[PDB]
From a paper:
The MavC insertion domain can be expressed and purified on its own, and a crystal structure of the insertion domain shows that it preserves an identical fold to that in the full MavC protein. An analogous NMR titration using purified MavC insertion domain (MavC128–225) yielded Ube2N spectral changes that are remarkably similar to those observed with C74A-MavC1–384 despite the large molecular weight differences. The insertion domain appears to behave as an independent Ube2N-binding domain but when built into MavC its rotational states provide specific functionality during the transamidation reaction.
MavC-catalyzed transglutamination proceeds via an obligate thioester-linked intermediate to form an isopeptide bond between Gln40Ub and Lys92Ube2N. Architecturally, MavC1–384 is composed of three distinct lobes: a core globular domain (CG) flanked by an insertion domain (residues 128–225) on one end and an α-helical extension (HE: residues 33–66, 356–384) on its opposite end. Ubiquitination of Lys92Ube2N, located adjacent to the E2 active site, effectively inhibits Ube2N activity and attenuates downstream host NF-κB activation.
Author numbering: 128 to 225
Amino acid sequence: NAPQKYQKIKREEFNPETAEKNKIYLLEDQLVYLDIFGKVIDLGQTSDTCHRLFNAITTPFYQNYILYDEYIDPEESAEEAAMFEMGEIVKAKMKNID
């Protein structure tokens, strides 16, 4: 059941009715899971945390990408640390989806 993908998105571009379902969306002030039914589920992060993650992930390849990339190394860049941090947040929030 669990999502495998995420993307950054701007708030005025995020339309749950037409966005890809079962996917994580990182906005500049919120982190959400769009579940398989199209329900936006908040993932409990402060706007400040989200602003930091949103702005740390700058590589074009990583704007719309996979959640648990085995080749990410948080010790090599702030971007990869932020991607790994988001993955750990999502993993914890998805703990009981299966």
